[PDB]
Design a protein around this ligand. Structure first.
Ligand SMILES: Nc1ncnc2c1ncn2[C@@H]1O[C@H](C[S@+](CC[C@H]([NH3+])C(=O)[O-])CC(=O)[O-])[C@@H](O)[C@H]1O
Length: 321
């Protein structure tokens, strides 16, 4: 297993302390009903613990030693990390192992960062953080603590593989929770929900739940699929949108701005809207199964195979009063 002791021990001592009234039970239960699990755990267990000599979290996620490591030592790490494929969120550069992930999560980062309130000093929740890539970038932009939640064992394992290789860094943590499970912590400075809203049956309740994690004057940063149109334009696909099951709402950005108004957010701004291109999302050596090219109408990339407008992503920023 993995021990969440460091985390509990950490939040025992800060403004997240009340979370201990629910978290350990929920994590215990999650660990209970987890029984290729061992492949993923051994990958983490068997990687060495290295303190990086150089650590860049400001412009990438890059770690290097003073003395470059043996060809064989790189290969051990390479092949253990290859055991945690598919790697979707990244990329990561760790002692010369370059994990070119399906997504250029960096692009999403470059398009979000400039519109943010200064992250320096902040405590942050990242809902649906995947591998945790963005959490490390949040550390680089000078956040005090970055906490993520994603109820997927693979991604908990990927994150722990990276932290281990980053010298067991304690400034970020991935809890295998789902966003439904949290109470109203009202303790985070900034909350990120990226690539999550459209997977929720109840989009307004998602926004309220996010709002319930924020201090007064906290900042929400919301990113999700979208469609062109006025306030009143909102697509709800059928069984498959870009081959994804369980897609619910894909509103227009203007519609999303209105939802946030309804859910009581303030100073809302559309900050980026960006067609997702096959150079932002694709097959790699570290993710071998289908990707965006396959989910697009082969004769018209402005549409999905099913025949819907193609993936488009907005970034909305907003403040809780
Ligand atoms: N109930 C849940 N609660 C919290 N997360 C969930 C839940 N269920 C599934 N997820 C997680 O939400 C993430 C959606 S991805 C965005 C990743 C990153 N944010 C990014 O912006 O690239 C896909 C995308 O939109 O590219 C996955 O990691 C799921 O495990």
């Amino acid at each position: 297993m993995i021990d969440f002791g460091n985390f509990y021990s950490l939040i025992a001592k800060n403004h997240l302390s009340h979370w201990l009234e629910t978290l350990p039970a929920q994590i215990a239960n999650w660990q209970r009903e987890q029984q290729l699990f061992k492949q993923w755990s051994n990958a983490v267990e068997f990687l060495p613990e290295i303190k990086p000599y150089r650590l860049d979290l400001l412009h990438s996620v890059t770690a290097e030693s003073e003395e470059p490591l043996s060809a064989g030592q790189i290969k051990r790490i390479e092949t253990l990390m290859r055991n945690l494929m598919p790697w979707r969120k990244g990329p990561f550069s760790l002692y010369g192992v370059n994990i070119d992930t399906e997504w250029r999560s960096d692009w999403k980062w470059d398009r979000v960062l400039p519109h943010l309130s200064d992250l320096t000093g902040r405590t942050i929740l990242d809902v649906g953080c995947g591998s945790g890539y963005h959490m490390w970038r949040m550390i680089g932009a000078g956040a005090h603590l970055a906490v993520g939640i994603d109820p997927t064992q693979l991604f908990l394992c990927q994150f722990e593989a990276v932290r281990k290789l980053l010298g067991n860094d304690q400034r970020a943590h991935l809890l295998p929770l789902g966003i439904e499970q949290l109470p109203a912590l009202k303790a985070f400075d900034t909350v990120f929900s990226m690539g999550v809203l459209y997977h929720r049956r109840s989009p307004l309740e998602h926004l309220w739940q996010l709002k319930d994690q924020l201090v007064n004057e906290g900042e929400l940063v919301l990113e999700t699929l979208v469609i062109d149109g006025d306030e009143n334009t909102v697509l709800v696909p059928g069984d498959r949108y870009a081959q994804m099951r369980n897609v619910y709402f894909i509103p227009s950005a203007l519609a999303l701005k209105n939802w946030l108004k309804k859910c009581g957010f303030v100073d809302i701004r559309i900050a980026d809207v960006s067609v997702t291109t096959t150079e932002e999302q694709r097959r790699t050596e570290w993710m071998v199964t289908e990707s965006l090219a396959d989910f697009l109408d082969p004769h018209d990339p402005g549409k999905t195979v099913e025949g819907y407008p193609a993936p488009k992503r907005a970034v909305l920023i907003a403040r809780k009063p």
